[PDB]
Amino acid sequence: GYSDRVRQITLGNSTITTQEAANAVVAYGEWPSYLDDKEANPIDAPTEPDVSSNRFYTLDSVQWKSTSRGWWWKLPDALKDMGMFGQNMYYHYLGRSGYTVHVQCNASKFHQGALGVFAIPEYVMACNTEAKTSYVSYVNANPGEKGGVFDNAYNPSAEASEGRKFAALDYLLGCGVLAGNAFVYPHQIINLRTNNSATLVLPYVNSLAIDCMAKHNNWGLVILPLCKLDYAPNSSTEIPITVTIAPMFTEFNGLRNITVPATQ
């Protein structure tokens, strides 16, 4: 009865079902966990918000078209305005979190296409001016739940002030490496003939036990069309991709007044 294709995930007051999964990935074979006393750093008693924040948040959906070049988000950035997770994040200097990432994309037995879904630690991307290096604004680096898109062209700006955004060039993974090698990162593929969802469980990954969430994204989430969407009755059709992410084993230190980042 039980199947690699059928799964339920419950976190807090939220549940996901899928009937066309393809197993699930646990990044680097490690489930998330709380921070042990023998690896701890800040000494204040941490806040562990548990069910208030460790639950599925669904981002705004994006549309997959035959011409789409792909999508990216950063974490914890994409969830910074999500319910109590966002509040706990911004009221504290320090935070750590794992995640369950559930990417959703159904179609029909007559559609075709394949999405690579990658979780990338320290997903540093190229800037869009050749007058400077590492020249990206905080606002452009941290788009929140809307994330960003890849392009198949690189057109760096005439003036440095206009190029302070990522050059998200698809085939170089926005960072000067070949996209065909992205499979070294934890990943699944949503191949429409096979499955309609990808599930990745991510431990906290960093060179520190805990860090400043508002300064530093631990993971990138990349969705790249490896094989373009095609549908014979209408090649211009679009199908939604929906991203739903739950923080897990969240832990926060250094409580004070709320952080309100710059918006422009």
């Binding site: 039980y2 199947s3 690699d4 059928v6 799964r7 339920q8 995930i9 419950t10 976190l11 807090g12 007051n13 939220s14 549940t15 079902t17 009937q19 699930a24 069910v51 369950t100 599930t199 469980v201």
Partner: protein, 281 residues
């Protein structure tokens, strides 16, 4: 015994999927909160005591209002006001009937209680001595009265209760008296099979329980002879099913009744009030 307590549960990431089912099977949804959320432990001490059938039916309900009078009657019509007969049923009123009709079959004993009230018809005709009432149960076949003072009221075998006005409401128990192994609240059939080429009328025959039911007759009189003052009385009849069993549940009555059957009335078949939109909180 109590209603269900809630166990402490966390989350899952599993090939076990209690949130999904297939109601095509005829099974209702079965999942409970612990299956689809993180739950705390809550001890449930509450019970379903008041929704047992005995509790649901454990009330004396008015099933009819009868009228009788006492005065010097000089016409046939006025003579017929000196006593009343009523075919025993629960279909004169709607409330107990609807509750019983959650079920197809039942078995119970009955408590019957009566409330008897009087008023003076007029004020220029003196007064009236305190009245005694006779309520006689006439089982099917026993002779029915044609006058308030005929021989039937001697009631040698029929049960009668003599009630004195102003006394406590009278009351008696009746056993389960059905000739089947349960009462039928619904009967999808007829009392006889009409046969090929018979001359018996088929144009004015009825259908269902009305063709087969007969619980006898209640006959009521004022035992006193007439005073100068005409007294008019009402007898309210109450039924409480007790020691109750029921079988085969049914959807409850959704629209007004229009008689003893399941028939409905054309101007009263729109129970729902339309909502403004499917998205109306």
């Amino acid at each position: 015994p109590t209603a269900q307590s809630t166990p402490l549960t966390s989350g899952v990431n599993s090939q076990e999927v209690p949130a999904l089912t297939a109601v095509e099977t005829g099974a209702s949804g079965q999942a409970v909160p612990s299956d689809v959320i993180e739950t705390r432990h809550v001890v449930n001490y509450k019970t379903r005591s008041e929704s047992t059938l005995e509790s649901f039916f454990g009330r004396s309900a008015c099933v009819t209002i009868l009228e009788v009078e006492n005065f010097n009657a000089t016409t046939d019509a006025d003579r017929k006001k000196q006593f009343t007969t009523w075919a025993i049923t629960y279909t004169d009123t709607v409330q107990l009937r609807r509750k019983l009709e959650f079920f197809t079959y039942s078995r119970f004993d009955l408590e019957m209680t009566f409330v008897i009230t009087e008023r003076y018809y007029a004020s220029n005709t003196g007064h009236a001595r305190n009245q005694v009432y006779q309520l006689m149960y006439i089982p099917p076949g026993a002779p029915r009265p044609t006058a308030w003072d005929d021989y039937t009221w001697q009631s040698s075998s029929n049960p009668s209760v003599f009630y004195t006005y102003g006394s406590a409401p009278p009351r008696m128990s009746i056993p389960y008296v059905g000739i089947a192994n349960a009462y039928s609240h619904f009967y999808d059939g007829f009392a006889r099979v009409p046969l090929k080429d018979e001359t018996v009328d088929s144009g004015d025959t009825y259908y269902g329980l009305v063709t087969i039911n007969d619980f006898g007759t209640l006959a009521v009189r004022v035992v006193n002879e007439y005073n100068p003052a005409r007294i008019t009385s009402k007898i309210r009849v109450y039924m409480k099913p007790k020691h109750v069993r029921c079988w085969c549940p049914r959807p409850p009555r959704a629209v007004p009744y229009r008689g003893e059957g399941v028939d409905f009335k054309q101007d009263s078949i729109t129970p729902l009030t339309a909502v403004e939109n499917i998205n109306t909180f």
